[PDB]
């Protein structure tokens, strides 16, 4: 598990593009790197337009709804029960009610006859993509059907009007159920001559974060609009839930504090509670409902901890697959218990409780493809590569366990990657870099917060507690971390951490929150090697032995000791050993390079005149020294190409 983790330094971009990004966006090289990796290049990519995505079927549904409203038809909004489904349902229910629609909600064939008597138009939120047979509402008695969902569409769309992103050719946005609900309300507003329903973007944003959709393009735009409307929401229940959790406008707070409370209600059978919170305009009742979700959340956490405690100490080792059975375990919390086991384990995880099953997988193992490998054993099932679910008679557990364990063995051990943006800059530059990274927010599925690589010997190390937690400094910057089993740092450490702005007592401190920490190891990254870092003393020996060598015109102080000493001086393109850097590229040259220690060459070590693209050259220089000291051919070679260009 803690041996199947790889650290990769992210590639450097072409310097002409790098500079293009720095200029537009107006930022330094570190932030430009992150921006370039996430695809942001014009000032336009940071604030995409929140516009009406032209989904396929959207206009017809909008027309169909206009008709429903004018003709006073009765509408039933049938939504999914997770946060995305509930916020989407609230969007449509509040939205349509505001326009004089006769509309009510409904949240989960045996119910089809109820839907029939109670409704003229049937609106599904984040569901119904493969509910064909329910074609009776369409057939047997004239009930109009509108389907809005974003779950994997079957081989053929179902009856009634369907509004699905993955059914719109081209289109590369990935709106969720709440997002689609939001677009549909928008389309209806266009038809009626009304302005965009921007006040519903907070509800849309919540659902969007909850369903872990990619935070880019439209999704990114939508969330920025919504995160900002939350503090003064038009929905007192959402504003009150957000304050209860100390919301400060950050997407991470939604994903981890707001949506979980809504989901807890649902997973515990009290989903109407969460829905009502989103629909009431009475603050008193809203206040009370927030207490109720707080109690449901606290309950879900309690059960989740008990289950985790019973299960984690089990079938984990190096078992290709983790298949555990907990008979009396609550079905509503096993999904999160699987994820926590999966993370602490880097192995697919299968849980079964009260005849229901959940799967959390990763790497080359498709969660749903494992289940398929043992499908005749299940009563029902379905999912994707990372998450899947099923029902099964617990009697078939051993058969199931073996099947899926055998299936996972058909693959290589999963390996977790940690993506490094770059070396962390000198402490003096941390503030500006942090402010420049700021425009990347909101962080999330789309774009994760960037990590930096700090490297050195830990000083002023001080524990804070009686284990794990500690603090220390690496080359002038304070780093906080949870020493992963051992405490006491090796003589030298490598850290992958978040650059933090820690407010305390009215003053700010910029330091690193380690997400991972370890004894130096081989780093992934760089381009195809051509320059191989060679230690200075080793290089001078060979030079003295008479090897064909190269010493650049700069620092003729060294080029002198060479003449005096009689080195077989040669031009860089033909000598296989360099004691310094040539001014212009020399490729097609598999060579060995040395800088020194006192070497004038080693003066890629002095600072400059900051602020401008001087900060660029400095990042390149820091890199060269790093790759040189770590004897990393790829990173050195890559850093050397960028060095050639930042000097042209």
Largest sheet: 8 strands, mixed
Number of helices: 20
Q: If you consult CATH, what is the topology of the largest domain?
A: inorganic pyrophosphatase (n-terminal core)
Which percent range describes the beta-strand content?
15-25%
Just give the CATH class of the largest domain. Answer: Alpha Beta
Level-2 CATH architecture of the largest domain: Alpha-Beta Complex
Number of strands: 23
Helix content range? 25-40%
- The geometry reads as elongated
Write out the strand line-up for the largest beta sheet, numbering strands in chain order: 1-12-13-17-18-16-15-14
The figure for the number of domains is 4
Distance between the termini: 46 Å
- The Cα radius of gyration reads 30 Å
- Could you say which structural class the secondary elements and strand pairing correspond to? alpha/beta
């Amino acid at each position: 598990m803690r041996d199947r983790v790889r650290w990769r330094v992210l590639s450097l971009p072409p310097l002409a593009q790098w500079r293009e990004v720095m200029a537009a966006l107006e930022v330094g090289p570190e932030a430009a790197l992150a921006y370039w990796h996430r695809g942001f290049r014009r000032k336009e990519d940071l604030d995409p337009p929140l516009a009406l995505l032209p989904l396929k079927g959207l206009r017809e549904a909008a027309a169909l709804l206009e008709e429903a409203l004018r003709q006073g038809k009765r509408i039933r909004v049938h939504g999914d029960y997770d946060a995305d489904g509930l916020t989407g349902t609230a969007i449509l229910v509040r939205g349509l009610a505001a326009l004089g629609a006769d509309v009510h909600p409904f949240i989960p064939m045996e119910r089809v006859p109820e839907h029939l008597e109670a409704s003229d138009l049937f609106l599904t939120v984040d569901c119904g993509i493969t509910n064909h047979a329910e074609l009776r509402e369409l057939l047997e008695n004239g009930v109009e059907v509108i389907v809005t969902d974003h779950h994997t569409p079957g081989k053929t769309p179902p009856p009634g009007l369907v509004v699905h992103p993955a059914l719109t050719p081209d289109l590369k946005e990935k709106p969720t159920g709440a997002g689609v609900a939001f677009l549909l309300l928008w389309a209806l507003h266009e038809r009626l001559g009304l302005p965009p329903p921007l006040e519903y973007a907070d509800l849309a944003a919540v659902g969007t974060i909850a369903d872990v959709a990619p935070l880019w393009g439209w999704n990114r735009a939508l969330v920025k609009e919504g995160l900002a409307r939350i503090p003064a929401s038009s929905w007192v229940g959402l504003r009150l839930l957000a304050e209860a959790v100390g919301y400060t406008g950050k997407a991470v707070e939604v994903a981890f504090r707001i949506a979980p409370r809504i989901n807890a209600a649902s997973r515990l059978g009290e989903a109407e509670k969460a829905l009502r919170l989103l629909l009431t305009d009475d603050a008193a009742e809203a206040q009370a409902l927030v207490g109720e979700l707080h109690r449901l959340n606290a309950r879900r956490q309690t059960l989740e901890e008990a289950m985790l405690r019973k299960l984690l100490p089990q079938a984990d080792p190096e078992a290709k697959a983790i298949v555990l059975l907990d008979p009396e375990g609550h079905p509503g919390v096993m999904g999160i218990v699987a994820s926590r086991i999966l993370e602490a384990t880097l192995r697919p995880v299968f849980l079964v409780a009260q005849g229901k099953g959940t799967v959390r997988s990763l790497a080359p193992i498709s969660a749903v493809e494992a289940l398929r490998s043992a499908e005749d054993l299940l009563l029902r099932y379905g999912g994707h590569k990372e998450a899947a679910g099923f029902a099964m008679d617990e009697a078939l557990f051993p058969a199931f366990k073996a099947r899926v364990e055998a299936y996972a063995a058909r693959f290589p051990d999963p390996v977790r990657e940690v993506a490094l943006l770059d070396l962390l800059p000198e402490p003096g530059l941390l503030p500006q870099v942090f402010r420049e990274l700021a425009l990347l927010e909101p962080y999330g599925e789309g774009n994760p917060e960037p990590l930096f690589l700090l490297f050195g010997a830990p000083e002023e190390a001080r524990r804070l507690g009686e284990g794990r937690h500690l603090a220390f400094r690496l080359k002038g910057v304070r780093v906080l971390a949870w020493k992963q089993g051992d405490l006491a740092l090796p003589p030298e450490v490598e850290v992958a951490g978040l650059l933090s702005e820690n407010a305390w007592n009215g003053h700010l401190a910029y330091e690193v929150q380690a997400v991972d920490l370890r004894k130096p190891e081989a780093l992934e990254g760089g381009i195809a090697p051509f320059a191989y870092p060679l230690p200075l003393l080793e290089a001078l020996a060979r030079a003295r032995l008479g090897e064909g060598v190269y010493v650049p015109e700069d620092n003729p102080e060294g080029l002198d000791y060479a003449w005096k000493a009689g080195f077989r001086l040669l031009p860089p393109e033909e000598a296989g050993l360099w004691l310094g850097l040539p001014p212009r590229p020399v490729l097609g040259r598999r060579v060995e390079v040395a800088l020194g220690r006192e070497a004038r060459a080693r003066l890629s070590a002095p600072p400059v005149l900051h602020t401008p693209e001087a900060r660029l050259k400095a990042l390149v220089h820091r890199r060269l020294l790093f790759a040189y000291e770590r004897r990393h051919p790829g990173l050195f070679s890559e850093a050397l190409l960028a060095y050639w260009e930042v000097n042209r």
